Design a protein around this nucleic acid. Sequence first.
DNA 1: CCCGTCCATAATCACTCG
DNA 2: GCGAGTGATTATGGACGG
Lengths: 215, 216
Amino acid sequence: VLMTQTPLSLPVSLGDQASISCRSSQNIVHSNGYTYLEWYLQKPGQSPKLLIYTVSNRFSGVPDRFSGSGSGTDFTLKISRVEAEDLGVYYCFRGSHVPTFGGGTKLEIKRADAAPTVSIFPPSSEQLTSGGASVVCFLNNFYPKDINVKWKIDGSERQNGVLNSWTDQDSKDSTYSMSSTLTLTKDEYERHNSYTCEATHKTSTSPIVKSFNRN
Amino acid sequence: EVQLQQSGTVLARPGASVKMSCKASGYTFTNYWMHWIKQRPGQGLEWIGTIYPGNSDTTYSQKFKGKAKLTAVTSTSTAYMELSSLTNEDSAVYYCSRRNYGSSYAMDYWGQGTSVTVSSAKTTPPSVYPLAPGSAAQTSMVTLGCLVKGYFPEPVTVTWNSGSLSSGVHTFPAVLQSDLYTLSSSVTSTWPSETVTCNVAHPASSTKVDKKIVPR
DNA sequence: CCCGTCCATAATCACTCG
DNA sequence: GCGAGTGATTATGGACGG
Protein backbone atom coordinates (compact mmCIF):
# COMPACT_ATOMS: atom_id res chain seq x y z
CA VAL A 1 0.00 0.00 0.00
CA LEU A 2 3.15 2.11 -0.36
CA MET A 3 4.16 5.00 -2.61
CA THR A 4 7.56 4.66 -4.28
CA GLN A 5 9.29 7.66 -5.91
CA THR A 6 12.03 7.76 -8.54
CA PRO A 7 14.72 8.76 -8.75
CA LEU A 8 16.12 9.09 -5.23
CA SER A 9 17.98 12.07 -6.62
CA LEU A 10 17.40 14.01 -9.82
CA PRO A 11 20.18 16.14 -11.34
CA VAL A 12 18.97 18.68 -13.86
CA SER A 13 20.64 21.62 -15.58
CA LEU A 14 19.07 25.03 -15.07
CA GLY A 15 16.65 25.89 -17.82
CA ASP A 16 16.29 22.23 -18.67
CA GLN A 17 13.35 19.99 -17.79
CA ALA A 18 13.17 17.87 -14.61
CA SER A 19 10.66 15.04 -14.11
CA ILE A 20 10.04 13.13 -10.87
CA SER A 21 8.20 9.80 -10.79
CA CYS A 22 5.72 8.43 -8.21
CA ARG A 23 4.23 4.92 -8.35
CA SER A 24 1.67 3.19 -6.19
CA SER A 25 1.69 -0.51 -5.47
CA GLN A 26 -1.96 -0.33 -6.59
CA ASN A 27 -4.83 1.75 -8.00
CA ILE A 28 -5.22 4.76 -5.68
CA VAL A 29 -8.47 6.29 -7.05
CA HIS A 30 -11.13 7.02 -4.45
CA SER A 31 -14.55 5.45 -4.92
CA ASN A 32 -15.75 8.86 -6.21
CA GLY A 33 -13.60 9.06 -9.29
CA TYR A 34 -11.17 11.52 -7.81
CA THR A 35 -7.52 10.66 -7.35
CA TYR A 36 -6.23 12.41 -4.28
CA LEU A 37 -2.57 12.33 -5.21
CA GLU A 38 -0.46 15.35 -4.32
CA TRP A 39 3.03 16.76 -4.60
CA TYR A 40 4.87 18.83 -1.99
CA LEU A 41 8.14 20.65 -1.84
CA GLN A 42 10.30 21.13 1.20
CA LYS A 43 13.33 23.37 1.04
CA PRO A 44 16.07 23.07 3.65
CA GLY A 45 15.11 24.76 6.91
CA GLN A 46 11.52 25.37 5.80
CA SER A 47 8.25 23.53 6.12
CA PRO A 48 6.75 21.50 3.26
CA LYS A 49 4.65 23.55 0.80
CA LEU A 50 1.88 22.40 -1.49
CA LEU A 51 2.52 22.27 -5.25
CA ILE A 52 -0.23 20.14 -6.76
CA TYR A 53 -3.39 18.41 -5.60
CA THR A 54 -5.68 15.85 -7.27
CA VAL A 55 -2.97 14.86 -9.71
CA SER A 56 -2.77 18.03 -11.78
CA ASN A 57 -4.42 21.01 -10.13
CA ARG A 58 -1.84 23.71 -9.53
CA PHE A 59 -2.00 25.37 -6.13
CA SER A 60 -2.32 29.17 -6.04
CA GLY A 61 1.07 30.89 -5.57
CA VAL A 62 2.77 28.05 -7.35
CA PRO A 63 5.01 28.74 -10.41
CA ASP A 64 3.53 27.79 -13.80
CA ARG A 65 6.68 25.76 -14.60
CA PHE A 66 5.15 23.04 -12.32
CA SER A 67 2.70 20.51 -13.79
CA GLY A 68 1.53 17.12 -12.63
CA SER A 69 0.02 14.13 -14.37
CA GLY A 70 -0.93 10.48 -14.15
CA SER A 71 -3.60 7.94 -13.17
CA GLY A 72 -4.29 4.71 -11.26
CA THR A 73 -0.71 3.76 -10.28
CA ASP A 74 1.59 6.12 -12.19
CA PHE A 75 1.93 9.88 -11.56
CA THR A 76 4.45 12.52 -12.70
CA LEU A 77 5.54 15.99 -11.52
CA LYS A 78 7.34 18.21 -14.07
CA ILE A 79 9.42 21.38 -13.87
CA SER A 80 9.37 22.68 -17.49
CA ARG A 81 12.50 24.77 -16.86
CA VAL A 82 14.32 24.34 -13.57
CA GLU A 83 15.18 27.59 -11.75
CA ALA A 84 18.08 27.77 -9.31
CA GLU A 85 15.44 28.27 -6.60
CA ASP A 86 13.92 24.87 -7.20
CA LEU A 87 16.43 22.82 -5.18
CA GLY A 88 14.95 20.76 -2.37
CA VAL A 89 13.09 17.49 -1.83
CA TYR A 90 9.84 16.74 -3.68
CA TYR A 91 7.35 14.25 -2.22
CA CYS A 92 4.22 12.72 -3.68
CA PHE A 93 1.54 11.80 -1.20
CA ARG A 94 -1.66 9.84 -1.16
CA GLY A 95 -4.31 11.77 0.67
CA SER A 96 -7.05 9.17 0.63
CA HIS A 97 -7.67 6.03 2.64
CA VAL A 98 -4.64 5.81 4.91
CA PRO A 99 -2.57 8.87 3.82
CA THR A 100 1.04 8.19 2.90
CA PHE A 101 4.11 10.07 1.67
CA GLY A 102 6.42 9.02 -1.09
CA GLY A 103 10.02 8.56 -0.13
CA GLY A 104 10.82 11.84 -1.78
CA THR A 105 13.19 12.88 -4.59
CA LYS A 106 16.01 15.38 -3.98
CA LEU A 107 16.50 18.00 -6.66
CA GLU A 108 20.07 19.01 -7.39
CA ILE A 109 21.12 21.59 -9.96
CA LYS A 110 23.39 19.89 -12.49
CA ARG A 111 26.54 22.02 -12.69
CA ALA A 112 30.11 21.56 -14.01
CA ASP A 113 32.61 19.41 -12.10
CA ALA A 114 34.97 20.76 -9.43
CA ALA A 115 37.83 19.36 -7.32
CA PRO A 116 37.94 19.44 -3.50
CA THR A 117 39.92 22.48 -2.33
CA VAL A 118 41.33 20.77 0.77
CA SER A 119 43.06 22.17 3.84
CA ILE A 120 44.04 20.11 6.88
CA PHE A 121 44.41 21.49 10.41
CA PRO A 122 46.50 20.39 13.41
CA PRO A 123 44.97 19.95 16.89
CA SER A 124 44.85 23.22 18.82
CA SER A 125 47.17 23.75 21.78
CA GLU A 126 44.09 24.44 23.90
CA GLN A 127 42.62 21.01 23.16
CA LEU A 128 45.82 18.99 23.84
CA THR A 129 45.98 19.28 27.67
CA SER A 130 42.20 19.43 27.56
CA GLY A 131 41.91 15.69 26.89
CA GLY A 132 42.18 14.55 23.29
CA ALA A 133 43.40 15.92 19.96
CA SER A 134 41.29 16.60 16.87
CA VAL A 135 42.69 16.85 13.37
CA VAL A 136 40.36 18.46 10.85
CA CYS A 137 40.06 18.41 7.08
CA PHE A 138 37.75 20.63 5.07
CA LEU A 139 36.81 19.63 1.53
CA ASN A 140 35.03 22.75 0.33
CA ASN A 141 33.32 23.59 -2.96
CA PHE A 142 33.15 20.57 -5.27
CA TYR A 143 30.81 18.80 -7.72
CA PRO A 144 29.34 16.21 -8.07
CA LYS A 145 28.59 15.41 -4.41
CA ASP A 146 29.82 11.80 -4.58
CA ILE A 147 33.21 11.85 -2.86
CA ASN A 148 35.20 9.84 -0.32
CA VAL A 149 37.80 10.57 2.34
CA LYS A 150 40.54 8.47 3.92
CA TRP A 151 42.84 9.43 6.82
CA LYS A 152 46.47 8.29 7.19
CA ILE A 153 48.71 8.14 10.28
CA ASP A 154 52.36 7.89 9.16
CA GLY A 155 51.19 6.80 5.72
CA SER A 156 48.98 4.17 7.42
CA GLU A 157 45.22 4.34 6.87
CA ARG A 158 43.04 5.56 9.72
CA GLN A 159 39.35 4.79 9.18
CA ASN A 160 38.23 4.23 12.78
CA GLY A 161 37.39 7.29 14.84
CA VAL A 162 36.50 9.97 12.29
CA LEU A 163 33.38 12.12 11.74
CA ASN A 164 32.04 13.81 8.60
CA SER A 165 29.39 16.42 7.93
CA TRP A 166 28.13 17.45 4.55
CA THR A 167 26.37 20.64 3.54
CA ASP A 168 23.43 20.77 1.18
CA GLN A 169 24.25 21.83 -2.38
CA ASP A 170 24.86 25.59 -2.06
CA SER A 171 22.09 27.46 -3.87
CA LYS A 172 24.40 30.03 -5.48
CA ASP A 173 27.42 28.15 -6.85
CA SER A 174 25.78 24.73 -6.69
CA THR A 175 28.63 22.86 -4.94
CA TYR A 176 28.89 20.68 -1.86
CA SER A 177 31.27 20.87 1.10
CA MET A 178 32.13 18.29 3.74
CA SER A 179 34.34 18.10 6.81
CA SER A 180 36.26 15.23 8.36
CA THR A 181 37.52 15.26 11.92
CA LEU A 182 39.94 12.77 13.47
CA THR A 183 39.67 12.45 17.24
CA LEU A 184 42.83 10.75 18.50
CA THR A 185 43.66 10.86 22.18
CA LYS A 186 46.33 13.21 23.38
CA ASP A 187 48.84 10.45 24.17
CA GLU A 188 47.99 8.83 20.81
CA TYR A 189 48.40 11.99 18.65
CA GLU A 190 51.79 12.40 20.34
CA ARG A 191 52.80 8.82 19.49
CA HIS A 192 52.92 9.58 15.74
CA ASN A 193 54.11 12.26 13.34
CA SER A 194 52.34 12.08 9.97
CA TYR A 195 48.69 13.01 9.30
CA THR A 196 47.16 13.21 5.84
CA CYS A 197 43.86 13.67 4.01
CA GLU A 198 43.01 12.35 0.56
CA ALA A 199 39.84 12.73 -1.48
CA THR A 200 38.75 10.50 -4.35
CA HIS A 201 36.60 12.53 -6.73
CA LYS A 202 35.35 11.51 -10.19
CA THR A 203 37.42 14.36 -11.64
CA SER A 204 40.29 11.89 -12.11
CA THR A 205 41.53 8.61 -10.58
CA SER A 206 44.31 10.66 -9.01
CA PRO A 207 43.60 11.67 -5.36
CA ILE A 208 44.22 15.12 -3.89
CA VAL A 209 46.63 14.91 -0.94
CA LYS A 210 47.06 17.50 1.81
CA SER A 211 49.15 16.90 4.92
CA PHE A 212 51.09 18.20 7.92
CA ASN A 213 53.61 16.96 10.50
CA ARG A 214 53.96 18.03 14.14
CA ASN A 215 56.80 20.44 13.29
CA GLU B 1 -5.05 34.59 6.80
CA VAL B 2 -4.79 30.99 7.93
CA GLN B 3 -1.94 30.47 10.32
CA LEU B 4 -0.77 27.58 12.36
CA GLN B 5 1.60 28.27 15.22
CA GLN B 6 3.31 25.41 17.01
CA SER B 7 5.00 25.28 20.41
CA GLY B 8 8.77 25.56 20.70
CA THR B 9 11.72 23.17 20.77
CA VAL B 10 11.60 20.42 23.40
CA LEU B 11 13.93 17.99 25.17
CA ALA B 12 12.80 14.86 26.94
CA ARG B 13 14.46 11.81 28.45
CA PRO B 14 14.15 8.27 27.16
CA GLY B 15 10.94 6.91 28.65
CA ALA B 16 9.51 10.36 29.31
CA SER B 17 6.66 11.71 27.19
CA VAL B 18 5.82 14.98 25.45
CA LYS B 19 2.81 17.01 24.53
CA MET B 20 3.09 19.63 21.85
CA SER B 21 0.54 22.03 20.44
CA CYS B 22 -0.52 23.78 17.26
CA LYS B 23 -2.59 26.94 17.54
CA ALA B 24 -4.74 27.70 14.54
CA SER B 25 -6.32 30.97 13.53
CA GLY B 26 -7.84 32.57 10.43
CA TYR B 27 -10.47 29.92 9.73
CA THR B 28 -13.19 27.86 11.30
CA PHE B 29 -11.22 25.24 13.27
CA THR B 30 -14.12 22.79 13.56
CA ASN B 31 -14.67 22.40 9.83
CA TYR B 32 -11.27 20.97 8.76
CA TRP B 33 -9.16 17.97 9.46
CA MET B 34 -5.85 18.81 11.13
CA HIS B 35 -2.94 16.51 10.18
CA TRP B 36 0.37 15.70 11.91
CA ILE B 37 3.55 14.79 10.13
CA LYS B 38 6.91 13.53 11.44
CA GLN B 39 10.35 13.98 9.95
CA ARG B 40 13.51 12.51 11.52
CA PRO B 41 16.93 14.07 10.76
CA GLY B 42 17.77 13.61 7.10
CA GLN B 43 14.83 11.27 6.66
CA GLY B 44 11.56 11.79 4.80
CA LEU B 45 8.08 13.01 5.65
CA GLU B 46 6.02 10.39 7.53
CA TRP B 47 2.24 10.74 8.04
CA ILE B 48 1.15 10.21 11.66
CA GLY B 49 -2.58 10.76 11.94
CA THR B 50 -5.41 13.22 11.82
CA ILE B 51 -8.22 14.65 13.84
CA TYR B 52 -11.43 16.48 13.12
CA PRO B 53 -11.87 19.06 15.95
CA GLY B 54 -15.56 19.15 14.97
CA ASN B 55 -16.23 15.82 16.66
CA SER B 56 -12.90 14.55 17.99
CA ASP B 57 -12.98 11.85 15.29
CA THR B 58 -9.38 10.60 14.84
CA THR B 59 -7.28 8.14 12.81
CA TYR B 60 -3.71 7.00 13.17
CA SER B 61 -1.08 5.57 10.84
CA GLN B 62 -0.87 1.96 12.01
CA LYS B 63 2.71 2.68 13.05
CA PHE B 64 1.77 5.40 15.54
CA LYS B 65 -1.24 3.94 17.29
CA GLY B 66 -0.57 4.15 21.03
CA LYS B 67 2.61 6.15 20.31
CA ALA B 68 0.77 9.35 19.35
CA LYS B 69 -2.46 10.68 20.90
CA LEU B 70 -4.19 13.67 19.46
CA THR B 71 -6.67 16.08 20.99
CA ALA B 72 -8.17 19.41 20.16
CA VAL B 73 -9.51 22.16 22.39
CA THR B 74 -12.25 23.95 20.48
CA SER B 75 -12.75 27.20 22.41
CA THR B 76 -9.05 27.84 21.73
CA SER B 77 -8.74 26.50 18.16
CA THR B 78 -5.63 24.55 19.35
CA ALA B 79 -4.64 21.00 18.36
CA TYR B 80 -2.37 18.81 20.51
CA MET B 81 -0.27 15.67 20.05
CA GLU B 82 1.22 13.65 22.90
CA LEU B 83 4.03 11.12 22.30
CA SER B 84 4.62 8.44 24.95
CA SER B 85 7.52 6.22 26.01
CA LEU B 86 9.88 8.35 23.95
CA THR B 87 12.91 6.75 22.34
CA ASN B 88 15.79 7.76 20.09
CA GLU B 89 13.50 7.17 17.11
CA ASP B 90 10.97 9.77 18.32
CA SER B 91 13.60 12.52 17.83
CA ALA B 92 12.50 14.85 15.01
CA VAL B 93 10.63 17.88 13.71
CA TYR B 94 6.81 17.47 14.05
CA TYR B 95 4.38 19.41 11.84
CA CYS B 96 0.66 20.15 11.93
CA SER B 97 -1.23 21.23 8.82
CA ARG B 98 -4.73 22.00 7.63
CA ARG B 99 -6.50 19.72 5.18
CA ASN B 100 -8.26 22.21 2.98
CA TYR B 101 -11.43 21.64 0.92
CA GLY B 102 -13.33 23.54 -1.72
CA SER B 103 -10.70 25.73 -3.37
CA SER B 104 -8.12 22.98 -3.02
CA TYR B 105 -8.10 19.44 -1.62
CA ALA B 106 -4.84 18.98 0.16
CA MET B 107 -2.66 20.17 3.04
CA ASP B 108 -2.40 23.87 2.08
CA TYR B 109 -1.25 25.35 5.43
CA TRP B 110 1.51 24.14 7.65
CA GLY B 111 2.82 24.94 11.07
CA GLN B 112 6.53 25.72 11.48
CA GLY B 113 7.43 22.51 13.20
CA THR B 114 8.26 21.46 16.73
CA SER B 115 11.71 19.94 17.18
CA VAL B 116 11.68 17.14 19.80
CA THR B 117 14.95 15.66 21.07
CA VAL B 118 15.10 12.47 23.13
CA SER B 119 18.21 11.64 25.14
CA SER B 120 19.29 11.08 28.73
CA ALA B 121 22.34 13.34 28.18
CA LYS B 122 22.83 16.61 30.10
CA THR B 123 23.38 20.34 29.40
CA THR B 124 27.00 21.18 28.57
CA PRO B 125 28.73 24.29 27.11
CA PRO B 126 30.91 24.01 24.00
CA SER B 127 34.68 23.91 23.95
CA VAL B 128 35.42 26.08 20.98
CA TYR B 129 38.87 25.30 19.57
CA PRO B 130 40.89 27.66 17.36
CA LEU B 131 42.17 26.21 14.10
CA ALA B 132 44.80 27.70 11.78
CA PRO B 133 46.84 26.11 8.94
CA GLY B 134 49.97 24.18 9.92
CA SER B 135 51.99 25.60 7.00
CA ALA B 136 52.94 22.74 4.66
CA ALA B 137 50.75 23.42 1.63
CA GLN B 138 50.95 25.13 -1.76
CA THR B 139 48.77 28.15 -1.41
CA SER B 140 46.01 34.34 -2.65
CA MET B 141 43.50 33.12 -0.07
CA VAL B 142 43.98 30.95 3.03
CA THR B 143 41.41 28.73 4.74
CA LEU B 144 41.41 28.69 8.55
CA GLY B 145 38.75 27.49 10.96
CA CYS B 146 36.97 26.97 14.24
CA LEU B 147 35.86 23.79 15.99
CA VAL B 148 32.98 23.37 18.42
CA LYS B 149 32.41 20.14 20.37
CA GLY B 150 31.27 18.21 23.43
CA TYR B 151 28.32 20.57 23.66
CA PHE B 152 24.64 19.96 24.39
CA PRO B 153 22.05 20.74 23.40
CA GLU B 154 21.48 22.28 19.97
CA PRO B 155 21.88 24.83 18.59
CA VAL B 156 25.03 26.97 18.57
CA THR B 157 25.35 30.56 17.38
CA VAL B 158 28.49 30.39 15.27
CA THR B 159 29.48 33.61 13.51
CA TRP B 160 32.72 35.02 12.09
CA ASN B 161 33.81 38.37 13.52
CA SER B 162 30.49 39.03 15.20
CA GLY B 163 28.65 38.69 11.88
CA SER B 164 31.04 40.52 9.58
CA LEU B 165 32.14 37.54 7.43
CA SER B 166 29.51 35.49 5.56
CA SER B 167 31.10 34.21 2.33
CA GLY B 168 33.97 31.74 2.28
CA VAL B 169 32.25 30.41 5.36
CA HIS B 170 31.13 26.82 5.73
CA THR B 171 29.48 25.88 8.98
CA PHE B 172 28.66 22.21 9.25
CA PRO B 173 25.74 20.27 10.78
CA ALA B 174 26.41 19.27 14.36
CA VAL B 175 27.05 15.54 14.35
CA LEU B 176 26.70 13.33 17.37
CA GLN B 177 30.05 12.69 19.06
CA SER B 178 29.15 10.79 22.23
CA ASP B 179 26.05 12.18 23.96
CA LEU B 180 27.08 15.60 22.79
CA TYR B 181 27.34 17.36 19.44
CA THR B 182 30.31 18.76 17.55
CA LEU B 183 30.35 21.12 14.58
CA SER B 184 32.93 23.11 12.66
CA SER B 185 33.43 26.21 10.55
CA SER B 186 36.08 27.08 7.96
CA VAL B 187 36.61 30.68 6.84
CA THR B 188 37.97 31.76 3.44
CA SER B 189 46.38 37.26 3.04
CA THR B 190 44.65 39.84 5.26
CA TRP B 191 45.39 37.32 8.01
CA PRO B 192 47.07 37.20 10.47
CA SER B 193 47.90 40.85 9.63
CA GLU B 194 44.39 41.89 10.74
CA THR B 195 42.12 40.25 13.33
CA VAL B 196 39.92 37.33 12.29
CA THR B 197 38.53 35.46 15.30
CA CYS B 198 35.73 32.97 16.05
CA ASN B 199 32.49 34.23 17.66
CA VAL B 200 30.54 31.25 19.10
CA ALA B 201 27.58 31.46 21.47
CA HIS B 202 25.41 28.86 23.18
CA PRO B 203 21.89 29.97 24.17
CA ALA B 204 21.22 26.90 26.34
CA SER B 205 24.51 26.94 28.25
CA SER B 206 23.91 30.67 28.46
CA THR B 207 27.47 31.22 27.27
CA LYS B 208 29.17 33.33 24.64
CA VAL B 209 32.86 32.91 23.98
CA ASP B 210 35.30 34.00 21.32
CA LYS B 211 38.39 32.16 20.26
CA LYS B 212 40.90 34.32 18.44
CA ILE B 213 42.74 32.25 15.80
CA VAL B 214 46.41 32.96 16.56
CA PRO B 215 49.15 31.23 14.46
CA ARG B 216 51.39 28.42 15.73
C1' DC C 1 -25.74 -18.53 8.27
C1' DC C 2 -22.06 -15.70 11.74
C1' DC C 3 -17.54 -13.64 11.43
C1' DG C 4 -12.74 -12.39 10.69
C1' DT C 5 -9.32 -11.34 6.53
C1' DC C 6 -8.21 -10.14 2.38
C1' DC C 7 -9.07 -7.28 -1.73
C1' DA C 8 -9.22 -3.55 -5.34
C1' DT C 9 -10.69 0.68 -5.68
C1' DA C 10 -13.84 5.94 -11.72
C1' DA C 11 -19.72 9.82 -9.45
C1' DT C 12 -20.96 4.79 -16.09
C1' DC C 13 -23.67 6.25 -8.75
C1' DA C 14 -27.80 7.63 -6.17
C1' DC C 15 -30.80 11.02 -6.02
C1' DT C 16 -32.79 16.24 -5.95
C1' DC C 17 -33.44 19.79 -9.36
C1' DG C 18 -36.34 21.85 -13.23
C1' DG D 1 -41.87 11.95 -15.78
C1' DC D 2 -37.65 11.81 -17.07
C1' DG D 3 -32.83 13.85 -18.61
C1' DA D 4 -29.62 17.21 -17.05
C1' DG D 5 -27.31 18.62 -12.97
C1' DT D 6 -24.48 17.57 -8.63
C1' DG D 7 -21.72 16.21 -5.06
C1' DA D 8 -15.29 15.08 -3.03
C1' DT D 9 -10.32 14.15 1.01
C1' DT D 10 -9.30 12.51 7.06
C1' DA D 11 -11.90 4.26 4.40
C1' DT D 12 -15.18 0.47 2.88
C1' DG D 13 -18.53 -2.55 0.89
C1' DG D 14 -18.22 -7.02 -1.27
C1' DA D 15 -16.19 -11.37 -2.24
C1' DC D 16 -14.17 -15.47 0.09
C1' DG D 17 -13.52 -19.46 3.10
C1' DG D 18 -13.03 -21.11 7.88
